[PDB]
Amino acid sequence: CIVRVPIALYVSLAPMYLENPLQGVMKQHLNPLVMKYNNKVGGVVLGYEGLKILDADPLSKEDTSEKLIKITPDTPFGFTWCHVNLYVWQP
Amino acid sequence: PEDFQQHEQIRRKTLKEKAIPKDQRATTPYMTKYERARILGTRALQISMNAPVFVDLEGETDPLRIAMKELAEKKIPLVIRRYLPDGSFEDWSVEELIVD
Amino acid sequence: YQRLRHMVNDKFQVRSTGPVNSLTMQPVKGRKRHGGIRVGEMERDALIGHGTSFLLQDRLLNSSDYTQASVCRECGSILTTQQSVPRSTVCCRRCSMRFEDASQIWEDGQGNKFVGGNETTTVAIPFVLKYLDSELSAMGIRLRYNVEPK
Amino acid sequence: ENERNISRLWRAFRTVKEMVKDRGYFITQEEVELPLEDFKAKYCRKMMSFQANPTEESISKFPDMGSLWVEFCDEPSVGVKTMKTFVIHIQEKNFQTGIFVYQNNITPSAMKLVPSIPPATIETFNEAALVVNITHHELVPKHIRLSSDEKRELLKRYRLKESQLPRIQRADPVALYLGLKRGEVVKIIRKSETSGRYASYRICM
Amino acid sequence: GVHVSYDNSIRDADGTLVQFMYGGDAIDITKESHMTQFEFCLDNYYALLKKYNPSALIEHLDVESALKYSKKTLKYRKKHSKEPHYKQSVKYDPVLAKYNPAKYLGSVSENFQDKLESFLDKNSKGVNEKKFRALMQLKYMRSLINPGEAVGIIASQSVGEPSTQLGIPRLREIVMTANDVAAVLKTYGVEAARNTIVNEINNVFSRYAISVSFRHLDLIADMMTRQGTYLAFNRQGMETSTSSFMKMSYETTCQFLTKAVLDNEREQLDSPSARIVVGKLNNVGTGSFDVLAKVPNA
Amino acid sequence: MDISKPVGSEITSVDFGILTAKEIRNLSAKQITNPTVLDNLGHPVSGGLYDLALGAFLRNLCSTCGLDEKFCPGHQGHIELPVPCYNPLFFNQLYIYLRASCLFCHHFRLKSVEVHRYACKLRLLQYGLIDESYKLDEITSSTLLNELKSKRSEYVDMAIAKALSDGRTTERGSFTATVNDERKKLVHEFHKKLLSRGKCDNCGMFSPKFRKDGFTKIFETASTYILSTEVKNILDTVFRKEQCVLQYVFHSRPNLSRKLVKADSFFMDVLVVPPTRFRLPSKLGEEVHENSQNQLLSKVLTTSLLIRDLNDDLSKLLEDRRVIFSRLMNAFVTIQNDVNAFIDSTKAQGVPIPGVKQALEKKEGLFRKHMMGKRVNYAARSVISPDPNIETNEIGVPPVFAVKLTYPEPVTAYNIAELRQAVINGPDKWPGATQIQNEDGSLVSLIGMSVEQRKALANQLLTPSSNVSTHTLNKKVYRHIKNRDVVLMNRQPTLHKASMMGHKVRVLPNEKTLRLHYANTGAYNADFDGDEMNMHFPQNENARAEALNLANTDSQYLTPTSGSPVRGLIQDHISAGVWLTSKDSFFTREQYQQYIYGCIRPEDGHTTRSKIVTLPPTIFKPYPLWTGKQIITTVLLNVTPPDMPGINLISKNKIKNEYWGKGSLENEVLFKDGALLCGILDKSQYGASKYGIVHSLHEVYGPEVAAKVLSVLGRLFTNYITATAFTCGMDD
Amino acid sequence: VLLGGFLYGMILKEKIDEYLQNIIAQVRMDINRGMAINFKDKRYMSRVLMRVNENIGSKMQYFLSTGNLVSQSGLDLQQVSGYTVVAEKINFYRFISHFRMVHRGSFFAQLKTTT
Amino acid sequence: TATTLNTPVVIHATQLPQ
RNA sequence: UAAAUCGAGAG
DNA sequence: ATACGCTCTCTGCTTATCGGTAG
DNA sequence: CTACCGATAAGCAGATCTCTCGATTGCGTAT
Ligand SMILES: [Zn+2]
Ligand SMILES: [Zn+2]
Ligand SMILES: [Zn+2]
Structure with missing residues (x-):
């Protein structure tokens, strides 16, 4: 009864993770989302896969290695969307 | 999961409509005073919170000084997004901008 | 020569974190109470005039009455949400419904259990905004604050 | 004052001829600079009535700009008898536009036939307002109507919505002189003290 | 909220365009001091040339087209001006209206270019004429007001602060409480009203011998006359404004709150007054753009 | 925050x-x-x-x-x-929509043709098509009225469809100042003519005239009081009948919610x-x-x-x-x-x-x-006292303020050199910390702590976080306002923007008053007869940037009122200029060298050569003399950047050519290739005057070089007046 | 110049008039409460007096400690507040100056025409 | 715990579960 | 711990 | 002794009663 | 002939910088 649920979250990235934004999103939010029941999904998240960061410039190729990440005004943190498929377990 | 998809699609479609293509923009190529100030402040904030260090540290401790050192060599990895009154925005990377 | 009575030990004051006017959360008024200084209309307009946007936003907002208040996404209200007694989250009241008509159930200290209304998120505002919200909902006017990332 | 009234009448006629020429209609300076002897030997008011048509250049810039009829009343006042007569006359030769002149006053009954027959717009003017041309005064700059291509280009240049431009009220004396219509953007050439001549705009509303 | 946009056109927070070119030339008054001091510029030609360093200011700037059009319009104007202003059919726009002064070198105002030409035509004197005009035009390119300047605030301060030193009541008869603007508007139209406003709001300052830059009087007059009428600076003029919170924060908060709530008015939080009331960053200067960070990994 | x-x-x-x-x-x-x-x-x-x-x-x-x-x-x-x-807020609205109705037909006393006409005009103004509605009015028995209404409705719907399909107005309307103006005018005419109907049009039977003597009470006349529930029910019925017509009088953007407006x-x-x-x-x-x-x-x-x-x-x-x-x-x-x-x-x-x-x-x-x-x-106020040796871009913070005001600096791998010793110092030993804001947001205090424990805490500032959730953040130290920081100084009233500048802070050791250089006197319009002014201390780097760069005292040389300068030394330095740059001013080698090093001390960066350069003596025999002109010349030569020529300038001053003797030429000032060859420095040259030497230095070398020139000119004229006085008397 | 001794007498007179009016209103209340009165009995005089406010001194002390003129009868003065000045006594100059200053009135402070 | 630094602001399901 | 009204002052 | 009843300005807008004009 | 729209004549509402101190803060009546 393992379901692959494609979620689309709005995560926030620290300055220390501008070098590995993928690993940054994984370490900040997805890792704090594994093995915990999620009501916004429905089951218990066994794992994740296919983390994909959206872009702030619509005029970029789908493989643009550099994507613009909007920076919040008051703070040095970035806020951006990410589409990612979670291998959730629903009883 | 279906009204959400329409919401996301409309968001990104209006985003692409507003976003002026790179090879059509008609804004002043200099990095104006306000833009320079904000770039320095934002990159300084980032440096304070353990952002990547490109430029060499000659004993500086004020993050605004490290930001100024990065701006001297144009190593600052930011992008200005100049907004037109209509809402259309032109993105200019820091490097493309000629300061003073 | 005459020594006038306007000495410096009466006319110097320096302000840091401390007493706040609790209904509007801006620092209290007074040298004796260790109160802050007014940055009025003529100072705000000058701060804007220099183009200093972050400076004005730090004097006016970030230092005096900055607060991270929860807002319900759908109903668009600030002073409607509340904490939930565990048997531990934040839920709303206006767009939540009593459990008599209906997981997503949360209980108050009165025991009145509700369902739904979990569409809330943090927004940074001046507290005087919350007080104006109250003093307007007293008059029957409702201000709905739609958040950006719906 | 009969000679004085004739002199004022000739001055108003010259100003009207010039105003007709300004809108882009076939008049020349020889007609415009029609001296007092010319006015006496040609018209010394129904004889002062006439028709004007666009020039070829104006037609190229304004494809829909039609014929114009200019009239001068006899009785110092105008009633629905004359105004309906003028509307019927407009419908008789199917003029796109027409303008009217009164000496003393016009009744609201006559004014009740102004929006009577759109889109065949008919305007109305006095004589004393046209004794002196307003656009000749130093303070008023030059105004120029823009073709819809020019207006569209102006709106796309600044990414403006139509009403976001500065407004000029449709009742402005300049708008009445140049016969502006709502949505017709005007380019104005201001001779500034600090920048010389520069181009601004105003949408008529 | 009246600031400088990126079209080099000044407009309110919402967007209602106030003027298209700042003062007609978009020159910053804090950088206009030594723009017409040609003899000074020539004497220190080498120092100025070192300070501007046109070596890296040509790889991203066009010169030829703007200079061509400026020459063409200069020749056309010298062909004209025998006749008064109404007969002077344009057939040719000023360079600033057609070309962006901050993107095309040589896009300069008519009076400035004419005075520079007069100087170069009365003073025939290692510096040549072409290099001197290149340096002067680059200096003009660097003497433009940056986008996002609170020109409304600066104009208000520059018309109010010197007014501290006929006189102030005359100001109140022109700015606040409606030769006479009413007569010239009812007879000659709206642009004559604007010119009369500027002239009378200037000559009172002149009689006090305070130098007041016309890039302020023009902005004031073009904000007053934005509706085609003689909108004074009182609550009557303010009533025609998009953002509610500014009007509530100004005066008669009850009447404006009623009018806001009866129309279910949804103000878009653009005015400087509104953005503070709701806790967001301002819309002038440093906040007039976003900042986004490039990240290496995909 | x-x-x-x-x-x-x-x-x-x-x-x-x-x-x-x-x-x-x-x-x-x-x-x-x-x-x-x-x-x-x-x-x-x-x-x-x-x-x-x-x-x-x-x-x-x-x-x-x-x-x-x-x-x-x-x-x-x-x-x-x-x-x-x-509701007392809406009593005038309730009292306009209480009248203008027929109590029997439960419509307005206006013919429904006019009511529908206004409804469609206001619906067109909902979408911004202002001119289209003016043509809507250009449309001119009872069964034909239904056709007239349907024609107007088709016209309005099709104009809306075209505008929305033309990319001219989205689904949320187009509302701006002008469309608002016309909407307000339309509604006001609507109400003015809506009371003009004393007799109903849908069923021509008269109605009583409601007369309100004052708020909280409404009276009918054929006098009679009317309960409030009657008014509520009456207007409830009226709004029910005309919901389609008031839907466009109580709205401006398209009611996408489609929620009916009631009388409740x-x-x-x-x-x-x-x-x-x-x-x-x-x-x-x-x-x-x-x-x-x-x-x-x-x-x-x-x-x-x-x-x-x-x-x-x-x-x-x-x-x-x-x-x-x-x-x-x-x-x-x-x-x-x-x-x-x-x-x-x-x-x-x-x-x-x-x-x-x-x-x-x-x-x-x-x-x-x-x-x-x-x-x-995080602000302070005090009384200002003058202080040369303050760089014209600095402000002298008393130790009291310097120990109270603090800034949260987050600890890094490069800052623990100085923040550790700031924590070791304590909240009293300037420079030092008063609080440690931890990773968990807890504000550990230092005011009531021992120095031993303070050092023990300092030894753990830059430790790794053992919390999986706070790995992003790091500790902050609330350091005292050091010498590198910036402060937004303002003096009420703020008549202009230049009155609220940003200065760099120098931590003076002695007295409790904000010590400020003379140049900014006209900028704040301040005196020192007890004038009070306030210092605001920003708390984030983005705020430091604006006062350091956009509102910085260097960036404020020319007032935008006319572009004129409002900086320049004021009273003593001007007379010291009229005397030091005289012809009578000759200076021995020792005096001239001391005057030059007295102001251009190259241990912090006053001069741009890192080794002071001198000038050849003006008078060789009998013994090496100099002139004040040469003093100005060598000061300019030392402060001006290298690999760049000196200034050239021709101007005048306020002192005529009669006040110096017959045939004199001191009234006209001449700088040639960075040397002062004629004329006396005056108010006109440095001071609140345009096109003088300091203005020219501003325009040529930049604003920062002009600021350094102002500091050095002030210091030199002061050191010259503290070695040579200048006094007014009763014989004068 | 009203000296403040004449003003003191005037306000004292008004206060004792108010005292008499209060006792007359007390008599009226007793008459319209059930009577049980006899005007020629010292017992009834002591009964009416002891229930009304005879503390005229504290009203003068109020007029001094707050400066507010509570005049039941409208006076010929054009103001109602600001009559007592604290003698700060920081200098003998300040103190001796207290006693030589006229005031036009708190009315005229808030005025536009400066004639 | 559980703040914007550690939890997504808004987490939606892109499509139906699969 | 407030907040108003009156008075006294600083610029 | 105390708790409960209380006759100094300036800009607009809005309301109003007397005029006609036109079917 | 009456109804509808102007038109002053009168009546009415809202307005005309920060900071430090001090003092004072309700009669009146029927229990
Ligand atoms: Zn809710
Ligand atoms: Zn609670
Ligand atoms: Zn009816």
């Missing part, structure tokens, strides 16, 4: 809508009954204005939420009004009591004065109980009914006036207590006193 607490959501916009009775009864945590705030023994009376469930009150855990006084935001309750009463919004079915947190009692030592809002709500609750009892007495059942009816009517009127008083404090009949509107109307209201101009934190 903390930079390490990021906020994602932002308020795009807000919209002003009326709250409805049904919505209130759903949100409320409790409805309050009795007009007693709190019973004796100190506890609050359950069901009163205060309560456990209206917010935690004075060490009483809130019932609604379950959190303490600090952690309870407060919750909103409501008052069940027995009868619906007028115009009436006070319920009063809303703010959380107890917003009506806490005035505590003054022993004195406790309850809120005026609490008193007004108590009065309304009393009137509610009285009128409810009169109603119940009438319910339990001639002459007794007559007296009870008169008393019930007066209870209605009194509760109406009490509600009007709780909202507005000037419509009442009876000095009067401030109402909720009175907390907003004028200055000292919630807008012009707590939103526009707030009261700021």
Whole structure:
């Protein structure tokens, strides 16, 4: 009864993770989302896969290695969307 | 999961409509005073919170000084997004901008 | 020569974190109470005039009455949400419904259990905004604050 | 004052001829600079009535700009008898536009036939307002109507919505002189003290 | 909220365009001091040339087209001006209206270019004429007001602060409480009203011998006359404004709150007054753009 | 505000809508009954204005939420009004839409053709097509009226369709100042002509004229009073019939919600009591004065109980009914006036207590006193005293301010060299820290701590986080305002923007007054006869950037009023210039060298050569002399950047050529290739004057070089006046 | 110049007039409460007097400690507040100056025409 | 715990579960 | 711990 | 002794009663 | 002939910088 649920979250990235934004999103939010029941999904998240960061410039190729990440005004943190498929377990 | 998809699609479609293509923009190529100030402040904030260090540290401790050192060599990895009154925005990377 | 009575030990004051006017959360008024200084209309307009946007936003907002208040996404209200007694989250009241008509159930200290209304998120505002919200909902006017990332 | 009234009448006629020429209609300076002897030997008011048509250049810039009829009343006042007569006359030769002149006053009954027959717009003017041309005064700059291509280009240049431009009220004396219509953007050439001549705009509303 | 946009056109927070070119030339008054001091510029030609360093200011700037059009319009104007202003059919726009002064070198105002030409035509004197005009035009390119300047605030301060030193009541008869603007508007139209406003709001300052830059009087007059009428600076003029919170924060908060709530008015939080009331960053200067960070990994 | 607490959501916009009775009864945590705030023994009376469930009150855990006084935001309750009463905000709206109707046909007294015409005009103004509606008016028996209405409706719908399909107006309307202006004009003409109908058009039967003597009461004449429930029902029926026509008079953007506008919004079915947190009692030592809002709500609750009892007495059942009816009517009127008083404090009949509107109307209201101009934190005020040796871009912070004001610097791998020793110093040993804001947001204090423990804490500033969730953040130290920081100095009144500049802070060791260089005198229009001014200390790097770069004292040389300068030395230095740059001014080798090193000390960066250069003596024989002109020349040569020529300038001063003797040429000033060859420095050269030497240095070498020149000129003229005086006397 | 001794006498006179009016209103209340009175009995005089406010001195002390003129009868003065000045006594110059200053009135402070 | 630094602001399901 | 009104002052 | 009833300005807008004009 | 729209004549509402101190803060009556 393992379901692959494609979620689309709005995560926030620290300055220390501008070098590995993928690993940054994984370490900040997805890792704090594994093995915990999620009501916004429905089951218990066994794992994740296919983390994909959206872009702030619509005029970029789908493989643009550099994507613009909007920076919040008051703070040095970035806020951006990410589409990612979670291998959730629903009883 | 279906009204959400329409919401996301409309968001990104209006985003692409507003976003002026790179090879059509008609804004002043200099990095104006306000833009320079904000770039320095934002990159300084980032440096304070353990952002990547490109430029060499000659004993500086004020993050605004490290930001100024990065701006001297144009190593600052930011992008200005100049907004037109209509809402259309032109993105200019820091490097493309000629300061003073 | 005459020594006038306007000495410096009466006319110097320096302000840091401390007493706040609790209904509007801006620092209290007074040298004796260790109160802050007014940055009025003529100072705000000058701060804007220099183009200093972050400076004005730090004097006016970030230092005096900055607060991270929860807002319900759908109903668009600030002073409607509340904490939930565990048997531990934040839920709303206006767009939540009593459990008599209906997981997503949360209980108050009165025991009145509700369902739904979990569409809330943090927004940074001046507290005087919350007080104006109250003093307007007293008059029957409702201000709905739609958040950006719906 | 009969000679004085004739002199004022000739001055108003010259100003009207010039105003007709300004809108882009076939008049020349020889007609415009029609001296007092010319006015006496040609018209010394129904004889002062006439028709004007666009020039070829104006037609190229304004494809829909039609014929114009200019009239001068006899009785110092105008009633629905004359105004309906003028509307019927407009419908008789199917003029796109027409303008009217009164000496003393016009009744609201006559004014009740102004929006009577759109889109065949008919305007109305006095004589004393046209004794002196307003656009000749130093303070008023030059105004120029823009073709819809020019207006569209102006709106796309600044990414403006139509009403976001500065407004000029449709009742402005300049708008009445140049016969502006709502949505017709005007380019104005201001001779500034600090920048010389520069181009601004105003949408008529 | 009246600031400088990126079209080099000044407009309110919402967007209602106030003027298209700042003062007609978009020159910053804090950088206009030594723009017409040609003899000074020539004497220190080498120092100025070192300070501007046109070596890296040509790889991203066009010169030829703007200079061509400026020459063409200069020749056309010298062909004209025998006749008064109404007969002077344009057939040719000023360079600033057609070309962006901050993107095309040589896009300069008519009076400035004419005075520079007069100087170069009365003073025939290692510096040549072409290099001197290149340096002067680059200096003009660097003497433009940056986008996002609170020109409304600066104009208000520059018309109010010197007014501290006929006189102030005359100001109140022109700015606040409606030769006479009413007569010239009812007879000659709206642009004559604007010119009369500027002239009378200037000559009172002149009689006090305070130098007041016309890039302020023009902005004031073009904000007053934005509706085609003689909108004074009182609550009557303010009533025609998009953002509610500014009007509530100004005066008669009850009447404006009623009018806001009866129309279910949804103000878009653009005015400087509104953005503070709701806790967001301002819309002038440093906040007039976003900042986004490039990240290496995909 | 903390930079390490990021906020994602932002308020795009807000919209002003009326709250409805049904919505209130759903949100409320409790409805309050009795007009007693709190019973004796100190506890609050359950069901009163205060309560456990209206917010935690004075060490009483809130019932609604379950959190303490600090952690309870407060919750909103409501008052069940027995009868619906007028809302004083909308009384003029209710009184315009109460008239202009036929009480029988339940339409307006205007012919429905005109009503529909205005409805479609206002619908076109909803979308911004202002000119299209002016042609809509250009359309000119009863069965043909339906066709005329249908034609206008088709015209409007098709114009809307074209504009939306043309990319000219989206689904949310196009509202701007001009379209707003025309909409306001249209509605005002609508109402002006809507009262012009004294006799109905749908059924031509006259109606009584409603006459209002004053707020809280409306009278009919054929005098007669009319109950409020009658007015509510009348306008309810009218709005039901004309919902399609008022849907476009009470709206400006497309009502995408498609929610019908009622007459219930115009009436006070319920009063809303703010959380107890917003009506806490005035505590003054022993004195406790309850809120005026609490008193007004108590009065309304009393009137509610009285009128409810009169109603119940009438319910339990001639002459007794007559007296009870008169008393019930007066209870209605009194509760109406009490509600009007709780909202507005000037419509009442009876000095009067401030109402909720009175907390907003004028200055000292919630807008012009707590939103526009707030009261700021991390700031100081004092009296200014002059101080040369301050670089014209610096301000001298007293040690008192220098120990109080603090900045949160987050600890890095590169900062623990100095923040560790700042923590070791303590909150008193300048420079040093007063607080450590940890990874968990806890603010560990240093004020009451020992130096041993302080060093022990310092040894753990830059440790890894053993919390999986706080790995992003790091500790902050609230360091004292050091010498590198920036401060926004302002002096009220702020007549212009240049009066609020940004200075770099120098931590003077001695006295409690803000020490400021002379040059900024005209910039702040300040004196030193006890003038007071304030220093604001920004707390984040983005704020430091603007005062350091955009509002920086260097960036402020020319006032935008005319582009003229408003800097330049003022009083002593000007006369020291008229004397030092005279022809009589000759200086030996020792004197000249001391004057030059007295102001261009190259140990911090005054001069751009790192080794002072001199000038050949003007008079060789008999012994090496110099001139003040040469002093100015070598000062300029030392301060001016290398690999660049000197200034060339021709100008004048205010001293004529007669005040120096016959044939003199000192009135005209000449700089040639960076050397002062003629003329005396004056007010015109340096001072509030345009095109002088300092202005030229500003224009040529930049603003920073002009600032350095101002500092060096001030220091030199001071060191010259402290070795040579200048005095006014009675013989003068 | 009203000297403040004449003003003191005037306000004292008005206060004792108010005293008499209060006792007359007390008599009226007793007459319209059930009577049980006899005007020629010292017992009834002591009964009426002891229930009314005879503390005229504290009203003068109020007029001094707050400066607010509570005049039941409208006077010929054009203001109502600001009559008592604290003698700060920081200098003998300040103190001796207190006693030589006229005031136009708190009315005229808030005025536009400066004639 | 559970703040914007550690929890997504808004987490939606792109499509139906699969 | 407040908040108003009156008075006294600084610029 | 105390708790409960309470006759100094300036800009607009809005309301109003007297005029006609036109079917 | 009456109804509808102007038109002053009168009546009415809202307005005309920060900061430090001090003092004071209700009669009146029926119990
Ligand atoms: Zn909610
Ligand atoms: Zn609570
Ligand atoms: Zn009817």
